[PDB]
């Protein structure tokens, strides 16, 4: 998945998240977190959104 144009508007359980990668506001529309799902696919998420932060550092630990 290249860039993000729309964010997911539905919170995902961390149990369904394998890993994340960031994307930046350069050469690409909006800064976003891209979650790698337990089911292969990637979801765009809003880094300003709260559940995204908590998912990110849960994944880190």
């Amino acid at each position: 998945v290249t860039c993000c144009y729309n964010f997911t508007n539905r919170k995902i359980s961390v149990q369904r998240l394998a890993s994340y990668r960031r994307i930046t506001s350069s050469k690409c529309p909006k800064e976003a977190v891209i979650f790698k799902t337990i089911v292969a696919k990637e979801i765009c998420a809003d880094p300003k959104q709260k559940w995204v932060q908590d998912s990110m550092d849960h994944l880190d630990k």
Partner: antibody
Amino acid sequence: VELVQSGAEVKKPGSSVKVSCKASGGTFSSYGISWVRQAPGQGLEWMGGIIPIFGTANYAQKFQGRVTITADESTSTAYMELSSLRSEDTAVYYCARYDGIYGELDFWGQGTLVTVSS
Amino acid sequence: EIVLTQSPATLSLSPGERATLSCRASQSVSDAYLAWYQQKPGQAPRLLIYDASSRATGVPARFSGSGSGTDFTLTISSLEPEDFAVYYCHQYIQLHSFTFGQGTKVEIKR
């Protein structure tokens, strides 16, 4: 999103039944198919589900040794074979779509009646 | 392994009254991964509420769900007679083991 199931079956006790569910798309590259039954006047029982890009299904333990759930990518059809049939298997069998990353059964097939009797 | 217990078994209310249905779980359901279905006589179940509190697609405004952990409630604010149905709760946090509540019947009182 339509889920079109095969027609009603009649089976002798001890045999097996294979129910099909054709999903509108070729789009179980993003979703899975659940099988849920309901004996007359009874509640909903999960039986198992498959997310096709996993190649293998998960089963509810009440049916564990008796059920096989498969999926064929080319025809976008999911299947549910239940063997060693008893009268308690007399039920309406539904297929239902779900998202692996969530799980709510958002779209349902019309159901297949399976009647198990002598 | 998560057992859902719905109460009451049957709910009798006159039209316009408020309906409150319960789904208590034997374990904490982890990210509000709980759903409500409506089933009218001789019809396929219809999704009403997902994520415990999100009203589904083409669902009338009088239907609402809420709660988290083990205590979940479905609310029909002003009961319509076309709401005579059985309502089911469903956890989907355990992908490998989906479970359903035994169902609550909502009936019109006259």
